[PDB]
Design a protein around this nucleic acid. Structure first.
Ligand SMILES: [Mg+2]
Ligand SMILES: [Mg+2]
Ligand SMILES: [Mg+2]
Ligand SMILES: [Mg+2]
Ligand SMILES: [Mg+2]
Ligand SMILES: [Mg+2]
Ligand SMILES: [Mg+2]
Ligand SMILES: [Mg+2]
Lengths: 286, 286, 286, 286
DNA sequence: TGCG
DNA sequence: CCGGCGC
DNA sequence: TGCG
DNA sequence: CCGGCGC
DNA sequence: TGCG
DNA sequence: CCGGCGC
DNA sequence: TGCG
DNA sequence: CCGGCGC
């Protein structure tokens, strides 16, 4: 009897395999590997073997794997988090955003004022130069919480009426919007330069919030500890990073005796900067 | 009224009145007012009248009122938040800490590593000069969450076992500590210089976290919108400020026709920077 | 006592003595000490003795000493920095900002846009609820650099004309404002809570600048290493702290056997977080 | 005679052309353009014509253009800044730092302590989890200042000896190392995701400094105002961005009547977020 | 080369 | 480090 | 189409 | 968005 | 009159 | 702005 | 205590 | 920690 989160984790991997997102080409290179690097090549191959990947196909265009990885991550989060309603109740929505959504975050309570800022800037110069446009934050995946009725708040006891706790964020109707619960950034693979946009997006969420900061996490299928470390090490922007196949990564590093990579892997794991994709749903329930 | 949060809000005010924390001296100065300040005096008197305050006594020493205000705010939050278990379940603890101990936050999961940094600085001077020492400063009041047993996670379904979600923060078992849910800073009265330690303490919680940022809020009995604004305006450090008698403050500003102060009050309230103490328990449930 | 900076340092101390800013009251408490604190009391008296202080006077009101300390520090900086024209040329101005605080900062190039932000907010609601108000920063003392004419830029060679380097900050020309060189915060004495406004003011200068960040320093007469450390330890907001009588503080710490204070003193000094007032003029020439 | 800075700007451009860094391929795509983007293609062609580019050759590998652009920008800054000794005297060094040099930054005074942090982490595995690792990242190009002899400080008057201003940063004494004057980040072209490492690197310089923050700027050859805005808008990390051919960009934007892009250009330029490469040497002299 |  | 290009 |  | 690969 |  | 002193 |  | 009050 495999527990349900183990079953969900396997379903997550299976979607990556069935869609040929994770596969091997005819030159033996696994699709999340950097073929110019011996350790990346071998680590990725070991992980794919542990995942029972058998398909041989050409590496998909990066735009395709990028988008598909976001979608599959979203489905896994939605399905697993749904089972935690008893430890973190709520009317939750999980969705892949899509760069098409400029100001999508302004539809949520903690960032609704960005609409007013944007509207004011579209009429004022150094307002625009000073405020910027990055505040136009667009997470890859977001988890949101819908507001609740007074009868839900009062389900067991008469706690509130219309003249008390009148600005509480959870109360529906104050002309109020849903709450942003989490920003989940996805990276199929990593290069240390381009991975830093997870930090700038995290800082924008920190700097502009009105209310509690959403969870800010990164999920990645990057095989190398060194590249993972470019976003996982350090604190202040990113809450934690989650690897798509942590157990398998650990097993391959141990098997091949890649001592330095192993040392770095444990610095991140023991240092609470890196976890497995299966840890994410429960971490979203704190 | 009869809603329980309304009763609890009154119990909070009554504790302040009964302990002479909020009282009026024989010169007519209410104890949360700046007697040299005309508007402070009048706004504070208006609020005391709406709270039905009648006791005449000398102002208590600032150390006494500061500590009592923290204690009374702690009791209000504990009492009210306990009623929201169906909206935000968990084994919650609310406690007044402050200077009773430094590095108290290192007792919690997201800041556990500060103990190691302090030990390292203890053996290497420099580290101390670069790392600083203020990361050891404890919030006036903290709300914490104890960890969960597998029996509870698996209350309705078989979700986890020892080989899946092994790093999830909520799971009890590997020396992992409880989670810090909220930092609640209290200020009986405000001066714009000394109010800024709430921003530096908030920034330290932001910069050093591993995991989701706790709620970071300030509760105050300061009567003037100008002084309240010295900590409520701006974003990035403080989630929101909660006033001890917001409805009364609004009413008196209207009655006195202090138009500029009323305008600032509304900028803060409509701008989601200022709410009533009764909004805090529900805001801790998002 | 031959070199001019040594003579200037002595003049600085003499102004503090002559104005009764630094004096000893009837209870033997020196005016920069906390009489309830044995270490503060003894350290401050030792320093006063090394400065050859003999005046007895009751302690000046804090508003008076705060303002006088700012004025005297400003005069020391102006006089000493004036002698470094050969290593840091320019048309420099040093001034205690004072009462006409708000937006003086916006007269300078790197922060001129703050005026636009303030005007916009005035004509409309929230904006200030997001943007805040503390950005109308008012440093205690500022050092500014006036702009240069082409004749000077082209003193030795024909480097520029009207069609090249047209946006260079240093070029005098309708529209261009003087540059803010330094923000010098003064604190006659310190309490750990109120000292934090130096960090928030420093962060505002960092976050809102257009151009190179000005020097951000703090000058203080606080006698105890513990209180000095509440602003000197750590990095990110304050470049460095300068003590009004560092050599004397070190000598008395050596004589008194307060080993924890001596250790803290050296962590800050060896750690480049604390220097002497005489180091400031040269540090402003980098 | 054309001004020497105008002549320097032309030499800068000539080096880009002679090395085929900036050229046009046989399909009409200029080497700093995004061939798939009509507006990018046209703007880049317009600029190339204004620089009188006539060479037809295939685009160089990105690694090649990236390194060459760094080298060429370094040579321009060194040559032009050397002519400003009368406005900003000193013993200056300008050098392209190879990604082949981590902790080169710790060779400089304001960041020397990073070596001690790195050694502490090497023996305290785990500390790296919190401290991070990128704090060892060195800028693409750095400008540094050697320390000054007391002979020069005392050139005209006897200002200092060994018992006064003993911790001054400029004094070639306290084992003190040279000072970091500027961090110059280069980007031949931009994509909004990879442009963000300039912000994370800038933040590391802000957060870890002891002393005055160095200049932090970006130089780019990106043709589109939209992509330039991904790094130029906003304040706090980057002092200002400098475009390799600003005058030409503006001219072609007008000739093609790209209204939105022109609006954005002026917002960045009037908003002091974007200047010409010719403005950089003088801006480094403030 | 490795990784920016 | 930058370039290509599919969603 | 343009752009993450 | 990710992938290739030269300094 | 009220910030610092 | 700084000072006093109960916590 | 000295400090928050 | 807050209170007093000069500038
Ligand atoms: Mg994204
Ligand atoms: Mg992504
Ligand atoms: Mg506190
Ligand atoms: Mg407090
Ligand atoms: Mg000040
Ligand atoms: Mg001051
Ligand atoms: Mg670089
Ligand atoms: Mg670069």
């Amino acid at each position: 009897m495999q527990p349900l989160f183990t079953q969900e984790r396997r379903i997550f991997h299976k979607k990556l395999l069935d869609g040929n997102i994770l596969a091997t080409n005819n030159r033996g290179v696994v699709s999340n590997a950097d073929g110019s690097n011996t350790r990346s090549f071998n680590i990725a191959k070991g992980i794919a073997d542990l995942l029972h990947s058998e398909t041989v196909s050409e590496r998909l265009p990066g735009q395709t794997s990028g988008n598909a990885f976001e979608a599959i991550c979203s489905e896994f989060v939605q399905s697993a988090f749904e089972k935690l309603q008893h430890i973190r109740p709520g009317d939750w929505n999980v969705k892949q955003v899509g760069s098409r959504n400029r100001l999508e975050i302004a539809r949520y309570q903690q960032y609704a004022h960005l609409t007013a800022l944007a509207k004011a800037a579209e009429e004022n110069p150094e307002l625009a130069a000073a405020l910027g446009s990055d505040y136009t934050i667009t997470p890859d995946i977001i988890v949101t919480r819908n507001l609740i009725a007074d009868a839900e708040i009062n389900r067991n006891e008469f706690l509130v009426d219309e003249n008390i706790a009148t600005y509480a964020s959870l109360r529906a109707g104050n002309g109020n919007m849903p709450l942003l619960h989490a920003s989940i950034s996805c990276k199929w693979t990593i290069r240390s330069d381009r991975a830093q946009n997870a930090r700038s997006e995290g800082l924008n969420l920190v700097r502009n919030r009105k209310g509690r900061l959403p969870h800010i996490v990164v999920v990645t299928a990057e095989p190398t500890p060194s590249r993972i470390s470019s976003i996982a090490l350090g604190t202040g922007e990113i809450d934690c990073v989650y690897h798509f196949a942590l157990y398998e990564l650990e097993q391959i590093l141990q098997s091949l005796n890649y001592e330095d990579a192993l040392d770095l892997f444990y610095i991140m794991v023991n240092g609470k900067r890196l976890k497995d994709i299966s840890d994410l749903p429960l971490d979203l329930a704190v």
